């Protein structure tokens, strides 16, 4: 099963990731989108500093207004980079979801509810990631991790 599981965390959630995100590592997040959701985000960060705001290696941001979409980006020295938008979003208000982020050597691969959703190339060395943050309107049931050599 998954390791270092966290159940029913209070949002906003900011926690240290147990192990380095070496290639093949999986981050599994199960939750539900509340009725009043406009957006929420899963951020893989370098630290937990609020001021100055810690760099966000990978910002996964589902948005629900209108047709909906998913915005991905990177924050470095408090400045957002170029956004990468996915218009084919599997998320929707009042529906449960399972997000699986697989950290590969050159990029992140994200699947939602068992379906491939998007790729995001590394802009910050993944070894610099040590914190997981979840913010916005989202209800998280569980957070779990799986190492590449797990068995």
Q: Which domains does the chain have, with CATH numbers?
A: 1-151 (2.60.120.200)
| CB 97, CB 90: distance < 8 Å | yes
Radius of gyration of the chain (CA): 14
Q: Which approach determined this entry?
A: X-ray
Strand ordering across the sheet containing 139-146: 3-7, 139-146, 25-32, 96-103, 107-112, 115-121
Q: What does the alpha-carbon distance between residue 34 and residue 123 come to, in Å, rounded to a whole number?
A: 31
What is the stated resolution of the deposited model, in angstroms? 1.9
Token duo for residue 126: 């993944």
Q: What does the alpha-carbon distance between residue 52 and residue 50 come to, in Å, rounded to a whole number?
A: 6
Instruction: List, in order, residues 6 or more apart from 123 with CB less than 8 Å away.
Output: 57, 74, 76, 81
Instruction: List, in order, residues 6 or more apart from 67 with CB less than 8 Å away.
Output: 87
Query: Measuring CA to CA, which residue among 72, 74, 53 is closest to residue 61?
Result: 72
| CB 28, CB 144: distance < 8 Å | yes
């Amino acid at each position: 099963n998954l390791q270092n599981i966290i159940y029913n965390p209070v949002i906003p959630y900011v926690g240290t990731i147990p192990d380095q995100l070496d290639p093949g590592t999986l981050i599994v997040i199960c939750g539900h989108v509340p009725s009043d959701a406009d957006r929420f985000q899963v951020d893989l960060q370098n630290g937990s500093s609020v001021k100055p705001r810690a760099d966000v290696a990978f910002h996964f941001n589902p948005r629900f207004k209108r047709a909906g979409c998913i915005v991905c980006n990177t924050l470095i020295n408090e400045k957002w980079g170029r956004e990468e938008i996915t218009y084919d979003t599997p998320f929707k208000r009042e529906k449960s979801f399972e997000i699986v982020i697989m950290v590969l050597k050159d990029k992140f691969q994200v699947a939602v509810n068992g379906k491939h959703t998007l790729l995001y190339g590394h802009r910050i060395g993944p070894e610099k990631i040590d914190t997981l943050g979840i913010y916005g309107k989202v209800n998280i049931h569980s957070i779990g991790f799986s190492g590449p050599s797990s068995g």
